[PDB]
Design a protein around this ligand. Structure first.
Ligand SMILES: [Cl-]
Ligand SMILES: [Re]
Length: 347
């Protein structure tokens, strides 16, 4: 049997009945636990995930969690997972700090159940907004328009796996789109799109690459895990297109050769709609976002002003045990890692 190389993510069209189930379950959890960060909820998360999710989602996510095969892209698009009432959501705040988590509470429950069904445990990183909770609102901030962050817009967000500078980077990611009126394409890149292991990829197993943290450094491997069907930690903007990356001549050459091959495999075909969720295996699939002017789209050579882009990000880890040396004593879900093993030294 010849291998069918994955070039695009799996598309799941969520039904109205599934959407109704998710909504009621979300409301029931809100009443039962108050919020998705409730320790009683988090402790029994997987029980809630398998008992409350529409069964087809549970089967999809369970299959996905343990699938690192040649055929696995490492991303799923859940089309119309939720119905977003745009007027109730109201205008997009100036930045992420102004997000109404009282209004997003139900969405946090829904997202945590999806991670719970992998099974995987939502976590937070001190490296990202000093934790900032299990659910992050990703909003274009006008002050950060030209930055290579989630608060950016005007510049292309090059494909990257989340937190390539951390040894304990997220295992799984979820991106829930509340609004994408600018019609910004989601860009995804899978290491599986390369097919069979080749000489360009083999050089990436060498632990000779700089993985710069954003805010002499240790080096890591870009490819790891299985030698034939590997996992990836990669950030094009931070490791390649950064004068201060400090890469060796050999490492930069290897990364350049890899990027030349990888850029032809980037998939920007999917334009998320309000209510879509993209679920990612952060060890298989990198993500990015094309450049856009927040609060507008162009149709028929005319500018259509619109509400600014709003997406919700949640990250999870399949094992609390393996990350225990980098988590808070009183919170095994709070990762204090700063850079490839080094922990933040706070006073
Ligand atoms: Cl992001
Ligand atoms: Re990201």
């Amino acid at each position: 049997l010849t291998l069918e190389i994955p070039t695009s993510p799996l598309i799941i069209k969520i039904t109205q009945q599934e959407r109704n189930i998710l909504s009621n379950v979300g409301n029931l959890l809100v009443k039962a636990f108050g919020n998705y960060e409730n320790p009683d909820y988090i402790a029994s998360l997987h029980l809630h995930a398998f008992q409350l999710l529409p069964e087809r989602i549970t089967r999809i996510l369970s299959q996905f969690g343990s699938d690192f095969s040649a055929e696995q892209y490492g991303a799923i698009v859940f089309q119309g997972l939720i119905e977003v009432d745009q007027d109730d959501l109201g205008p997009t705040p100036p930045n992420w700090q102004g997000a109404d988590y009282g209004k997003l509470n139900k969405y946090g429950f829904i997202c945590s159940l999806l991670h719970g069904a992998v099974p995987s445990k939502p976590v937070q990183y001190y490296a990202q907004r000093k934790g900032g909770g299990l659910l992050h609102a990703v909003i274009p901030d006008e002050k950060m328009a030209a930055t290579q962050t989630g608060s950016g817009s005007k510049t292309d967000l090059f494909v990257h796996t989340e937190d390539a500078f951390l040894s304990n980077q997220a295992d799984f990611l979820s991106f829930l789109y509340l609004r994408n009126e600018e019609r910004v394409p989601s860009t995804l890149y899978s290491i599986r799109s390369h097919g069979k292991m080749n000489p360009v990829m083999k050089k990436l197993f060498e632990p000779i690459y700089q993985c710069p943290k954003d805010a002499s450094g240790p080096t890591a491997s870009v490819l790891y895990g299985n030698r034939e069907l590997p996992f990836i930690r990669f950030d094009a903007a931070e490791q390649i297109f950064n004068e201060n990356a400090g890469q060796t001549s050999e490492a930069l050459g290897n990364l350049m050769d890899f990027w030349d091959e990888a850029k032809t495999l980037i998939n920007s075909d999917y334009i998320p709609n309000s209510g879509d969720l993209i679920f990612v295996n952060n060890h298989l699939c990198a993500h990015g976002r094309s450049a856009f002017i927040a609060g507008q789209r162009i149709e028929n050579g005319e500018i259509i002003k619109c509400e600014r882009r709003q997406m919700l990000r949640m990250m999870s880890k399949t094992s609390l045990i393996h990350i225990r040396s980098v988590t808070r004593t009183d919170d095994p879900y709070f990762i204090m890692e700063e850079h490839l093993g080094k922990i933040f030294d706070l006073d």
